Amino acid sequence: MSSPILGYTQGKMNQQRVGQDNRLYVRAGAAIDALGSASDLLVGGNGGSLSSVDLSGVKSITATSGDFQYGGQQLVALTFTYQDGRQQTVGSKAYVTNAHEDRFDLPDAAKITQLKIWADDWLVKGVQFDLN
């Protein structure tokens, strides 16, 4: 049980098992610089600011891509919406033009167990989430 690949399958792919705390760790700013199962296990570039996302209660994940203000077509944002209606976003939608949104709605009784991250030396290009 896997999600579609949100964003682009460019760069090298790293795969990570989700930690016991069930949080997704990020470095981000105008886009998503890095992702990982832990703050020390970020894959991607060396930019952005560190933040975390609780993976518990996730109903849907929404990717925002498009023409990046600082060059190229990039994955600039991932927005997590929870069963309680709350929404947390990592990355940004403020530095993109001609943007499109790929939304992935999780099936009932699906837990995120694996992370697949496509990135280069700068930014994260794409992500895929494997379930139970």
Give ∠ CA 110-91-51 in degrees, rounded to 5. Answer: 75
Q: In angstroms, what is the minimal distance from the CB of 71 to ligand MMA?
A: 10
Please tell me whether residue 35 binds ligand MMA under the rule CB under 6 A. Answer: no
Q: What's the rounded Cα separation, in Å, for the pair 88 and 86?
A: 7
Residue with tokens 């703050």: 39
Q: Which stretch binds ligand MMA (CB under 6 A): 11-19, 24-32, 55-63, 101-109?
A: 24-32
List the one residue out of 40, 28, 35 whose CA is nearest residue 14: 35
Please tell me whether residue 112 binds ligand MMA under the rule CB under 6 A. Answer: no
CB 48 within 8 A of CB 33: yes
Query: Nearer to ligand MMA by C-beta: 28 or 55?
Result: 28
Q: What's the rounded Cα separation, in Å, for the pair 38 and 43?
A: 10
Please tell me whether residue 30 binds ligand MMA under the rule CB under 6 A. Answer: yes
Q: Strand 12-17 relative to strand 6-7: parallel, antiparallel, unpaired?
A: unpaired
Please tell me whether residue 44 binds ligand MMA under the rule CB under 6 A. Answer: no
From the CA atom positions of the chain, what is the Rg in Å? 13
Q: Which stretch binds ligand MMA (CB under 6 A): 4-12, 26-34, 35-43, 97-105?
A: 26-34
Give the one residue of 7, 11, 36, 48 binding ligand MMA; rule: CB under 6 A. 48
Please tell me whether residue 29 binds ligand MMA under the rule CB under 6 A. Answer: yes
Query: Nearer to ligand MMA by C-beta: 48 or 129?
Result: 48
Using Cβ positions, the residue closest to ligand MMA within the complex turns out to be 29
